Amino acid sequence: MATLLTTDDLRRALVESAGETDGTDLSGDFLDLRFEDIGYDSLALMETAARLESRYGVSIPDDVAGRVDTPRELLDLINGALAEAA
């Protein structure tokens, strides 16, 4: 199958932008925790997304990235992107 990001991959990028260079661990069901509820700013969200984007080869526009209220959506986007990438 296409190599999709796991929740560990997602979480790693997530944690590091979440605060002061690794700020919020998100060890638990972070997909069910909305960014607003985890003290997340969408700038950190952009920073997180762009890292994954540039590292694995996906494209998530500003309007779309700053519109993924839940982390499962970010991985959903990357799922649809990476699985359809060769």
Task: Give a verbal description of the structure.
Keywords: Antibiotic biosynthesis, Phosphopantetheine, Phosphoprotein. Acyl carrier protein. The modification O-(pantetheine 4'-phosphoryl)serine is found at residue 42. Residues 4-82 form the Carrier domain. This protein has 86 residues and is an all-alpha fold. The chain has a single domain, classed as ACP-like (Non-ribosomal Peptide Synthetase Peptidyl Carrier Protein, Chain A), CATH 1.10.1200.10. The protein is built from four helices and no strands. Helix 1 crosses helix 2. The radius of gyration is 12 Å and the shape is globular.
Features:
monomer; 86 residues; mainly alpha; Non-ribosomal Peptide Synthetase Peptidyl Carrier Protein, Chain A; 50% helix; globular
Topology:
Blueprint: H1 7-18, H2 42-56, H3 62-65, H4 71-82
Helix pairs in contact: 1-2
Task: Tell me about the largest β-sheet.
Answer: none
At the fourth level of CATH, the homologous superfamily is ACP-like
End-to-end distance, in Å? 10 Å
Radius of gyration: 12 Å
**Would you state the CATH class?**
Mainly Alpha
Number of domains: 1
CATH architecture field: Orthogonal Bundle
Proportion of strand residues: under 5%
Number of helices: 4
- What structural category characterises the helix and strand content? mainly alpha
What would you call the shape?
globular
Using the coordinates shown, work out and report the CATH topology.
Non-ribosomal Peptide Synthetase Peptidyl Carrier Protein, Chain A
What is the percent of helical residues? Answer: 40-55%
Count of DSSP strands: 0
H and E string: HHHH
